[PDB]
């Protein structure tokens, strides 16, 4: 007596001529009909989580890959996914690396539909126009600062690096980024404690804040994020920005005309290469009435030949399924290469209930030292402690 409900969240949400022509297709093969409601990435969680709470919404859910399946597996509000993975063709050709995104106690719930590493995105006729070679991207922290200062001309609204500095998941990811670039982590390896507050992470975040307040090459940290910069990279404004495979459609659609003109690369880093994972899974609450039918959208939505034909189409983000990665015509682009030899090294969020918690602390951590309200000592210290204490209660 519910229709099938499918809540699509993210940036690929903006895909949504693709997403009708994906459901419609799936509509047409199995005499079911979808209600779907698309959310933007900066409020998804809010609204995912109240509406599991009161037990209401979706019957397949969007769900990121950082965290949040352990947080909704661990209050019993998702439905598990061990049965029908154990039955389904696609279960081995899903990138190994993905499962423990969404295993809470040994118990897969979520089905991994697309992944992604984070990377350096940067803009080509940018460094061409600064006197750079496009084709031989900074490495190191110093190239990067040294590219960044070159590049920016604050007077004209151009800018070398954009730095995330909003209360998103965007700055947590900035921050850790620097973080393991400096061979630093987050979390200790059994997830107890806090690891961050380090002679590395105080590195990292003084220099993570330091190209926005004393360098001065990004946009207004506070107010902007990864998707705001790869926008502005598309209106030749950002130079260089983090983001990854889930960018490259988004910012063609942006602007048609930069097509070959932007690439990515390694992150440049000090002690160690740093990457983070990401992407996104589809859940099934366990008080969606619509259970057996959710897994037949998730099943569709994730088979070789949806995922064939949106590759295709689209070029991003990167597929969950090995076999499509290998079999499509990505590898023959070389911002790919670059990707597919990252993916696997790229360092995950802690697959834990209390993540989400420590991303806030994280986003306040970065934000207080960017409205000079805290030193990076002082802020470093507190956010720290906060973590210890979410992690021991
Ligand atoms: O694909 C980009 C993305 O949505 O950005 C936000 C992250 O939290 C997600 O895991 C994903 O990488």
Not at 268 to 296: F, Q
Request: some cysteine; hydrophobic content about 40%.
């Amino acid at each position: 007596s519910k229709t099938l409900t499918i809540w699509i969240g993210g940036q690929v949400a903006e895909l949504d001529e693709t997403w009708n022509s994906v459901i419609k297709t799936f509509e047409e093969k199995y005499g079911i009909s979808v209600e779907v409601q698309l959310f933007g990435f900066d409020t998804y969680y809010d609204k995912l989580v109240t509406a599991l709470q009161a037990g209401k919404g979706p019957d397949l859910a969007f769900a990121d890959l950082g965290g949040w399946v352990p947080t909704f597996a661990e209050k019993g509000w998702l439905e598990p996914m061990e049965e029908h993975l154990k039955n389904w063709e696609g279960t081995a050709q899903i990138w190994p690396n993905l499962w423990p995104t969404v295993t809470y106690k040994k118990i897969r719930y979520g089905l991994p539909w697309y992944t992604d590493c984070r990377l350096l995105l940067y803009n080509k006729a940018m460094f061409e126009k600064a006197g750079l070679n496009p084709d031989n991207p900074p490495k190191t922290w110093d190239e990067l600062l040294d590219a960044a200062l070159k590049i920016t001309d604050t007077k004209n609204r151009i800018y070398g690096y954009g730095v995330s500095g909003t209360k998103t998941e965007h700055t947590t990811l900035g921050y850790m980024m620097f973080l393991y670039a400096a061979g630093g982590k987050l979390l200790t390896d059994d997830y107890s404690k806090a690891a961050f507050d380090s002679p590395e992470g105080l590195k990292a975040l003084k220099f993570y804040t330091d190209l926005a307040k004393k360098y001065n090459v990004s946009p207004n940290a506070i107010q902007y994020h990864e998707d705001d910069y790869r926008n502005m990279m598309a209106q030749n404004r950002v130079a260089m920005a983090i983001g990854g495979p889930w960018s490259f459609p988004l910012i063609e659609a942006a602007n048609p005309d930069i097509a070959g003109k932007y690439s990515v690369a390694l992150h440049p880093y000090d002690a160690k290469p740093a990457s983070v994972l990401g992407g996104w899974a589809l859940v099934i609450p366990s008080s969606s009435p619509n259970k057996e039918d959710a897994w037949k959208l998730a099943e569709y939505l994730t088979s070789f030949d949806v995922w064939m034909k949106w590759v295709e189409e689209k070029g991003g983000p990167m597929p969950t399924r090995m076999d499509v990665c290998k079999k499509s015509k990505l590898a023959n682009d070389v911002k790919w290469q670059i990707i597919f030899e990252t993916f696997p090294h790229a360092v995950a969020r802690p697959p834990i209930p209390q993540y989400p918690q420590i991303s806030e602390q994280i986003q306040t951590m970065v934000q207080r030292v960017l409205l000079g309200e805290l030193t990076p000592e002082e802020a470093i210290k507190i956010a720290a402690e906060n973590v210890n204490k979410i992690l021991g209660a």
